[PDB]
Amino acid sequence: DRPWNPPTFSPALLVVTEGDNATFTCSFSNTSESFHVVWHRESPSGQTDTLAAFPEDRPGQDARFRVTQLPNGRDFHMSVVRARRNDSGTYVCGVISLAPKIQIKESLRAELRVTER
């Protein structure tokens, strides 16, 4: 029954130039034996796009988006290889607990700005 806090999606504003790579950080404290962490892109008109998740199944993803776990097991990196100008917008990460109890918590929105070269 031990309560835990919603994930943090840093930085709140990530600014990279197109061609380079951008990496977010999703951090939280896991009290779960079975859990998933997902990466969403929230655009206007209400469309939520699922980019990557952990653990990776293969499921067919864009491959420019991948979610990898750091050794400490509490921090996760949401990376984008060769960021496009169309990759700008708001992004969020969420965590899914299945084992202790079924609960879901989502991080705050983080703006990604892709500047021209």
Partner: protein, 214 residues
């Protein structure tokens, strides 16, 4: 990776009616109920918990006791459809579905509930037959607060007495009753119009008085 998709991010439902919101998830073969998990919630309240091919009702919120259910038939086709009967204002808000089936994902569905003043009850009483004075009453329920405009067939603006109270039947609903006392002749027509307020949050600006210039 595993992605849950939603056809309609927004539902507008009429008050008192039934709504069915859907969440889609990949199914390439026979549905394996043992590995399937379906979760529905709204404002941190558990609505539907479907695990190990069976619905777990122990954690379900009291507000949805015998009015919410998951359509089993649609699951095999890869459709998680939540059906809620007798929709109230408290059901208006942001819903979230979670699906676990060889992977896990969740999506968000906005549900709006419209409670119009469309059920209008009326009454006509003769106060004094000598002076032909009549008393007209209109009443209806809805949200938010509504004002009543009385007009003649001439469309002239008339002033009546309006009383607005909380509905006894359902919470957060306003019971609006208006009464007009007027002298009139037979078969003349009167209209009571329920003007409602914006069902969306109002916008406010803060103004701070600055120093007096030289």
């Amino acid at each position: 990776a595993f992605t849950v998709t939603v056809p309609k991010d927004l539902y507008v439902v009429e008050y008192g009616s039934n709504m069915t919101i859907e969440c889609k998830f990949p199914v390439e073969k026979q549905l394996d109920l043992a590995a399937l998990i379906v979760y529905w919630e709204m404002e941190d309240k558990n609505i539907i918990q479907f695990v190990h091919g069976e619905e777990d009702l122990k954690v379900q919120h009291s507000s949805y006791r015998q009015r919410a259910r998951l359509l089993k038939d649609q699951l095999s086709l890869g459709n998680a459809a939540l059906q809620i009967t007798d929709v109230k204002l408290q059901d208006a808000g942001v819903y979230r579905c979670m699906i676990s089936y060889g992977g896990a994902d969740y999506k968000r569905i906005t549900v709006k509930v419209n409670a119009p003043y469309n059920k209008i009850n009326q009454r006509i009483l003769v106060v004094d037959p000598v002076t032909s004075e009549h008393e007209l009453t209109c009443q209806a329920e809805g949200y938010p607060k509504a004002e009543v405009i009385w007009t003649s067939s001439d469309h002239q603006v008339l002033s009546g007495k309006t009383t607005t109270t909380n509905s006894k039947r359902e919470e957060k609903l306003f019971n609006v009753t208006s009464t007009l006392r007027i002298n009139t002749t037979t078969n003349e027509i009167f209209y009571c119009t329920f003007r409602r307020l914006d069902p969306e949050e109002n916008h406010t600006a803060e103004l701070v008085i600055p120093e007096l210039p030289l």
